[PDB]
Write a protein that binds this ligand. Sequence first.
Ligand SMILES: [Mg+2]
Ligand SMILES: [Mg+2]
Ligand SMILES: [Mg+2]
Ligand SMILES: [Mg+2]
Ligand SMILES: [Mg+2]
Ligand SMILES: [Mg+2]
Lengths: 122, 182, 52, 142
Amino acid sequence: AEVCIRTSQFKVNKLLNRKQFIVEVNHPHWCGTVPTQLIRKKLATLYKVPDASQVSLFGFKTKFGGGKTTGFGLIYDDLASLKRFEPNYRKTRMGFGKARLPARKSVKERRNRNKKLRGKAK
Amino acid sequence: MRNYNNFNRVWKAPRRPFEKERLDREMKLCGQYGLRCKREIWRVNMTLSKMRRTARLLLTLPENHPRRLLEGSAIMRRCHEYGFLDEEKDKLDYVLSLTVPDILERRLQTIVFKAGLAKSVHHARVLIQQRHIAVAKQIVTIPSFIVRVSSERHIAFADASPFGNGRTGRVKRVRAKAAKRH
Amino acid sequence: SLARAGKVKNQTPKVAKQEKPKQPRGRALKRLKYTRRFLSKVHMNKQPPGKA
Amino acid sequence: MTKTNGQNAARKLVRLRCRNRWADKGWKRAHTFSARKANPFGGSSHAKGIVLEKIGVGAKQPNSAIRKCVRVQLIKNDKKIIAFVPNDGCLHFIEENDEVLVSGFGRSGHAVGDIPGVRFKIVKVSNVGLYALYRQKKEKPR
RNA sequence: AUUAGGGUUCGAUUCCGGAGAGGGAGCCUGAGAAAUAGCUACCACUUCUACGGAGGGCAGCAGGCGCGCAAAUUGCCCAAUGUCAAAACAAAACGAUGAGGCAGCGAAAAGAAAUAGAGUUGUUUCAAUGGGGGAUAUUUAAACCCAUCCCGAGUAACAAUUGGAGGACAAGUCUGGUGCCAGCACCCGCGGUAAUUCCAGCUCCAAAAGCGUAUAUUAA
Ligand SMILES: [Mg+2]
Ligand SMILES: [Mg+2]
Ligand SMILES: [Mg+2]
Ligand SMILES: [Mg+2]
Ligand SMILES: [Mg+2]
Ligand SMILES: [Mg+2]
């Protein structure tokens, strides 16, 4: 059960301080789907990135019939650059994201009540 | 609302639903190629009638007309790559001579049986539906797949099937589980 | 009138179904018809003419 | 020697066709409003009503039978019609003051068969299909 | 939509244009309105009150009542597409958005497709696979579906239906019951004691996860 990785369309983005590419994974005779964590470690080793936390991988699609999976990947220059530019929902998947806000319905009712009042008591 | 995905139909029912001559002929084709319902024949009719309609319009146009030089070689190329016409026929008036069996032989179900992977058309149908046949290393599960000429030499058993390089089947594994339970 | 309503339907003696074994639904049924009608004045189901 | 033929004679040909289309009985019915007012249905395919009573209609000669029917008052416009009740039995399923769904008889307002002057048919009683009750695939509610 | 050609017919409804916000007038602000989740009055309905008075406008999204032959959840989210704006993102430090997106209900309609397959003697074997049940996991804003992978079929009960069998029109001189009654029948026609047509059983026919009926409309 080996894994082979090939990156198709490589582009370097000086703005946003990252590199973008398409990831292709070949896993013949593998049981199930390849976890995203495993692909990150191989990608970091292949591209000589120091910290594996600098790699971001988006939604993967499995080919019909098995043995191949394709997705999208990002490699940031620094760890600070990743946290500054990444969307919150992807940062939550990694493990360091802001907590979910209260339900929108409660926010709507609170603001509508305050529309009546005017003073410092609103 | 505000959705712009297209769709169309691919078949139509015949006039005169109870014509005895047509009923016998359609029953002939159904048993010879292992089809499921008369709808599989009728979608072949619509493909054939569309091809003849565009050929008839092109032949009315004079030769050396731009819409005849282009779109005339394109349709003839399609027939050659898929195998409906042999390479010897290059005239644009041999498209009008195509028959229903000429298309039904290029289905994956008929190709698998003729090649030798299956012993009958009905055995071929279940093999395709059970993920045992691969075309150029790709598993195909659709019996109506139309095989290209260049793809015929690459039709073989799938590497993930027990008949190829895959693990054992369901009954062999179930028997093994029972043997280990004992 | 209106009294003779449903006369014959209620008069008919009740006969139960036979509950035969099932049939090959699907592509297998089309195969069965093809092998019966062909490859063993063409007559479909023929009654015993000994009645008359 | 029946029609004009001139190259600049389009106006005559247009007027001639317009007046002669009215002689078509089918064309006239679809382009006037008298039929729609006459139709107990307001141009719909079905209507609902209340059963007033059960009647029997004699079959026209040379047939001989008593065809079972009911008279219905429609809810949308309070018009009264006569509807045939098909199939053996099937009159016991219908009681007075029941709601029914009525449909056409298949000839677009023309009478059908040996039933004199009947152009409607019952298809539902008490929100349950009449044929379903006849086959015993459902039970009469309430 | 239908159509050899010429034609006939539909277009409330996604894009463009117009008009309206219960009805009817009038107006302020403003670059722009004769604006209606702005104001003023009258008419028709209607809510609260301590009776002095004060309010209302779903032909926005969900919902409810009526009307009818006739049409969904008082759901999740701003992740995407946009709009506004005092505004990149991030850092104590998260703009709004029923536009819009996502799912629930949904045989309007449209694709692909299971309900087995291969054999030995005169009824007995062999493999294969889905529906289904789960996953280190994958997808997703979060879920769900798809895709990927294993414990599982022999009445493989994991059991296919809807209309028909005189003619038009494919398919029974079959067997009982009824006796111009009951009923069938789009039309022609069956039924009055030996019914190819009704009510049933059997056997056959057509289309098939679909098949009948009604009303419009195109061809015929
Ligand atoms: Mg497999
Ligand atoms: Mg028009
Ligand atoms: Mg008035
Ligand atoms: Mg609403
Ligand atoms: Mg019968
Ligand atoms: Mg008899």
